[PDB]
């Protein structure tokens, strides 16, 4: 969705409505940080 290459037409209107990246204490939110680095300057805030 951040690349916005295909969300509009080929796939339905909007990309999947959400993501729940859960899991036991471990890899959780490291992939979120990696996606944040790989994406644009619109970067995450870690709220508790």
């Amino acid at each position: 969705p951040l690349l916005h290459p295909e969300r509009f037409v080929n796939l339905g209107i909007e990309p999947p409505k959400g993501v729940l990246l859960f899991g036991p204490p471990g890899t959780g939110k490291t992939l979120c940080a990696r996606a944040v680095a790989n994406r644009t300057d619109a970067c995450f805030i870690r709220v508790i």
Partner: protein, 354 residues
């Protein structure tokens, strides 16, 4: 005759005194452009040996202006939020009141844009409630000249995903009038009389803003079937229930602001909300058949142009006991994977949820 001198005095007296009206009005209006004190009207009908008023100022004081020196008490009833002179300690002018914090804008959509065409399957039921609700809005004068006051209480009972919410908002859009949505399951507040106050100001807001659509959801949650037990007996929520009942009769004259209640099982309600003037139009909302489900998902995916010539017949065969929401989820699941494609990217949507 005397008309020449009469009109010569008439026009001058008219224009000069209206100028005096304007002079008066401006001298109070800039004070009306500077009101400061809330108007807690402890109304005392002191007839001159006509009326009077007691105003609780915002600065914690009491001003007993005589005979309500600027405004009529027909429009100024005992309440609050009416302009009070900051210097003359007098009632200036009415102004909109406060809609009970939450009710100020709980979830009020100013105008819904969803159309009647994108929903379907229950077209007979949707046309019935259109005749019972939307027609009393557009052709309200037809009912007025007929002599029959339209009914207000329409109860849409049926399993979730049958499109009660879209239909209600589409009906409100067709009426082009105000739409107010009530989140029923969260109306159960620990505060004493909180739900009573929320329903009171919700009806007040609907009355103040056009012939509205009061769309109260989860009527089963709001009202129990009086199946009292040792665990619970619907003690407090009965207060919220009787308030709603007493507020149903407020708009009987001029027949505006319709009540639309959405639930799944009508039978969980006692035979008290069901009445001619109260909730009367109980409309079934069944799960659509294979044809209706296929048409609904086709309409939802109409804005999707990826896989040409998909008749959705296998989808209709595989859409056993699914809702309009489930059909929408099925088609947007294809609308998430179609980067399958034709007649086979639809099944997994239902399988994902469980």
């Amino acid at each position: 005759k005397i008309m020449k001198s009469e009109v010569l005095r008439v026009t001058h007296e008219l224009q000069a005194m209206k100028d005096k009206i304007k002079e008066n009005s401006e001298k109070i209006k800039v004070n009306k452009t500077l009101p400061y004190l809330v108007s807690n009207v402890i109304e005392l009908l002191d007839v001159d040996p006509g009326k009077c008023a007691v105003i609780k100022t915002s600065t914690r004081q009491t001003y007993f202006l005589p005979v309500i020196g600027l405004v009529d008490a027909e429009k100024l009833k005992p309440g609050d939020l009416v302009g009070v002179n900051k210097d003359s300690y007098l009632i200036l002018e009415t102004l909109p009141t406060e809609y009970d914090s939450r009710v100020k804008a709980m979830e009020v959509d100013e105008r819904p844009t969803e159309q009647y065409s994108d929903i379907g399957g229950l077209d007979k039921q949707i046309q019935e409630l259109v005749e019972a609700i939307v027609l009393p809005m557009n052709h309200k004068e037809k009912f007025e000249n007929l002599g029959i006051q339209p009914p207000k209480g329409v109860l849409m009972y049926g399993p979730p995903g049958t499109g009660k919410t879209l239909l209600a908002r589409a009906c409100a859009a067709q009426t082009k009038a105000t739409f107010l949505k009530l989140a029923g399951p969260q109306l159960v507040q620990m505060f004493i009389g909180d739900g009573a106050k929320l329903v009171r100001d919700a009806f007040a807001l609907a009355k103040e803003k056009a012939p509205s659509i009061i769309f109260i959801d989860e009527l089963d949650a709001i009202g129990t079937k009086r199946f009292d037990s040792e665990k619970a007996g619907d003690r407090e929520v009965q207060r919220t229930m009787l308030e709603l009942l007493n507020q149903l009769d407020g708009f009987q004259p001029n027949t505006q602001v319709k009540v639309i209640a959405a639930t799944n099982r009508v039978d969980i309600l006692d035979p008290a909300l069901l009445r001619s003037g109260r909730l009367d139009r109980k409309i079934e909302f069944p799960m659509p058949n294979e044809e209706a489900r296929a048409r609904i998902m086709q309409i939802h995916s109409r804005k999707m142009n990826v896989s040409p010539d998909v008749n959705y017949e296998e989808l209709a065969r595989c859409t056993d006991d699914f809702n309009g929401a489930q059909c929408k989820a099925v088609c947007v699941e294809a609308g998430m994977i179609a980067l399958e494609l034709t007649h086979e990217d639809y099944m997994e949507g239902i399988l994902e949820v469980q």
